[PDB]
Amino acid sequence: IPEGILMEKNNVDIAEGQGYSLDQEAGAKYVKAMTQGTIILSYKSTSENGIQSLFSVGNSTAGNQDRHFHIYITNSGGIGIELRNTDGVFNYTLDRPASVRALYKGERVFNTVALKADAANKQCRLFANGELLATLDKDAFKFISDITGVDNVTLGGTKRQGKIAYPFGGTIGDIKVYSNALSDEELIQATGVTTYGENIFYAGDVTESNYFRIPSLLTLSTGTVISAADARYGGTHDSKSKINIAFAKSTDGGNTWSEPTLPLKFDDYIAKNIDWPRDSVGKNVQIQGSASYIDPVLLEDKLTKRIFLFADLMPAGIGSSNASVGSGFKEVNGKKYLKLRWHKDAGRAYDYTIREKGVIYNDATNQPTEFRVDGEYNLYQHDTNLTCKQYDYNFSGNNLIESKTDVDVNMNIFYKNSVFKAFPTNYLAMRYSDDEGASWSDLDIVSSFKPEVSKFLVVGPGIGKQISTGENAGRLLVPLYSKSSAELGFMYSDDHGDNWTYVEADNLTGGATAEAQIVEMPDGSLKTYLRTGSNCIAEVTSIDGGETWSDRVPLQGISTTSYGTQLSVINYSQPIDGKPAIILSSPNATNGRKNGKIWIGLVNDTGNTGIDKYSVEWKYSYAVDTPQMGYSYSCLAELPDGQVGLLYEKYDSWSRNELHLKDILKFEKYSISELTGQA
Ligand SMILES: CC(=O)N[C@H]1[C@H]([C@H](O)[C@H](O)CO)OC(C(=O)O)=C[C@@H]1O
């Protein structure tokens, strides 16, 4: 077996189910006996077949169907390999979901993939579109030379008992088979030749997070486009984990993005890049004692030009599912104050309050203590800043070890080792900025209005809304949802963000996930679209600036799952087909978060008044990729040019099989021409 390229083929069209034989290639004899090596190939799949082998080498004879090696892709964008010589001898597998795509902007596109079988390092590595996807370490290194009775080298399928299995359909742009193991750098470079859309936040950036979720995108009146997202450090798990809120902006219409910042973050647990295990056991493990911020909402007050960032604030070890029932506040002298528990009192004895100027009072004696908190809620004892040891987290097999380090961080009321601990329910936090993110204000916990009977009261991630016309012109609104007297809710402000008022939009006590986004009608009335626990997206209308809302009505014609997925709906500044238009994004499949689509809805005046004044005709739908390709949370934004920007999760964020995937938050842009099927 010579050193270097053993075989190369270009521009091979493969009819679905036919495959293509490489047995007469000069180097087939070498490829059939490879002890290690590298395979790199460019392809365009035109088939919807479940599993599609790109390249294979094996035994095609009767009874030898489990004797082969193949690199394959799935119609859902997964990619992987199977190295087999019957299960009793060996069955090595490696894969990663949502690694490749099929369609981009209405046309089938090429993807570049690579498999590296490194004998010297006893390791197998998969790459695709500039990314290292997965790694397999085996003490008993095996390759093609280890398969019994190899008799074929095939493109577009795997020969099993004389039949073409895992049938590919499309074009193999180029395939190169090397006897040697190329470097990871060479492969990142080689496969990186085909990329689609761009990343704002990514694994390796200054956030020090390997994972991201929950996108927020907003174009400011100044033309600057801003964005935010959960920077999920301990895998992609929801709260009761270590999560911070990342932020970035673009001053060139979304072409390039600034070095990300972390406006909302906690330091009780270190922020670091860690590969979370994806095996059947480890994937379920999450960080237990860390505080976190989760689900961002961005909003601009066009009058003052001030921007706001809201997010749920989870005390140490808390998430929505394990939050305690209560507001977290106590009323004294008619005023609500954040309540605290001295670490040496009874488990549920919150006999202290944070009052004016952060001074902590003893409620029993009604006298101030020697403690106080600053604008960041960090503790001070007699004007000295208190501190505690920061925690680190590492896996020891399938067990996640959370241990204290020697690093001192400021003691915060939301940390597990604080001497004064906040009530274990969730809070609503916010910071404002008058310089587009160069600096942010102190931490403002606006949830003093949280019903004492509620388990959780959280935000509907995405963007907020400011009424532009009518009697309530200027009012700021942020969507909320909860497990309490109401499900859907909202908080609004008439004094440009200084103070907020809570509104219950229904009387549902089930606590279903009613994440919503708000859109304004021509006369200033509002229509809110929301996720529900039923098989449809719901619509509610308000004619009094969000103070009262109509009963839910299903959004007819736009399919979804029972559990649902967050959606994005925005106003568009110019008319489409001569009418006011709103744009909606959401996965369209009835099972699984996949088949994402962008819809354009035209506003019609029915001729009636009040709640029934307007009707929306969802005239256009745009499919982002093929039907099985993953698509979850998203956020649309009208860019300074006519375009519509989209920051979304390109995978299935609900699936227990697609957890902990890096670089799945993508940014794409589309013209109204594209969106309306007008090419
Ligand atoms: C605060 C919080 O936990 N938010 C999470 C929310 C929630 O858990 C709910 O009950 C519905 O699943 O769900 C999801 C989700 O991908 O489905 C993402 C959010 O980040």
From Swiss-Prot:
Class of enzymatic activity (EC top level): lyase
GO process annotations (BP): ganglioside catabolic process; oligosaccharide catabolic process
Positions of BNR repeats: 248-259, 431-442, 491-502, 540-551
Record carries keyword Secreted: yes
Location within or outside the cell: Secreted, Extracellular space
Pfam families to which the protein is assigned, alphabetical: BNR_2, Sialidase
Keywords: Glycosidase, Hydrolase, Lyase, Repeat, Secreted, Signal
Major site of localization recorded for this protein: secreted
EC numbers, comma separated: 4.2.2.15
Domain of life: Eukaryota
GO CC annotation, single: cytoplasm
Active site positions: D238, E515, Y633
Binding positions for substrate per the UniProt entry: R213, R531, R593
Protein family per UniProt: Belongs to the glycosyl hydrolase 33 family.
Protein name, UniProt field: Anhydrosialidase
Species whose genome carries this gene: Macrobdella decora (North American leech)
